[PDB]
Amino acid sequence: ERDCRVSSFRVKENFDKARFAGTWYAMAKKDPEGLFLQDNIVAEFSVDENGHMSATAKGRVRLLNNWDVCADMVGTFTDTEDPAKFKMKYWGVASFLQKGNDDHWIIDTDYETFAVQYSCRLLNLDGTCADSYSFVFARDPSGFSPEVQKIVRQRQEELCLARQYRLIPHNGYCDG
């Protein structure tokens, strides 16, 4: 019954960028295909005088050859017609880091405790997502109340991504 068209997905009513600024800890994630951040992920959002939003993020990345590395990444966001939908150009501090362009949607947030993000990097012909990713972020590393977990579990259902998210460890590897 429930529609999986990325076009139909709901997003944050009247997104407020400055209000999202600060440190966010990823608690759980739904990885995309290929190399992705492993764990110990922490994002840090900024918004300039102009309204230009930017972010930095640390995360452990396992390189093909098995070395583990603490990837220091960079992201710049571009506004769209949808205040909660942005275009994100990212790159790493080190040259060997994945560089790219991806959609960045703020599905839901309360700005103070949690946030569900999402990106489809490929649309199937039908209109659903063939390559997605999603971050569940928390204001406090400790996580959230069974109350908010309810909400999140709900946003996840709506993104056609329930029962396929994983918990993210934080063990200070990239120093925390």
| Interacting residue with ligand REA among 42, 47, 57, 152 (CB under 6 A) | 57
In the complex with ligand REA, which residue's Cβ is closer, 14 or 67?
67
Is 161 a binder of ligand REA (CB under 6 A)?
no
**43 binds ligand REA, rule: CB under 6 A:** yes
- Backbone φ and ψ for 151, nearest 5 degrees, come out as -55, -55
Interface with ligand REA includes 76 (CB under 6 A)?
A: no
Q: Which of 39, 38, 44, 47 is nearest to 24 (CA)?
A: 44
Smallest gap from residue 59 Cβ to ligand REA (A): 7
Q: Are 136 and 165 in contact (CB under 8 A)?
A: yes
Structure tokens at 115: 């946030």
CB 174 within 8 A of CB 61: no
State the residues that interact with ligand REA by CB under 6 A: 35-37, 43, 55, 57, 61, 71, 73, 75, 90, 92, 97-98, 117, 135
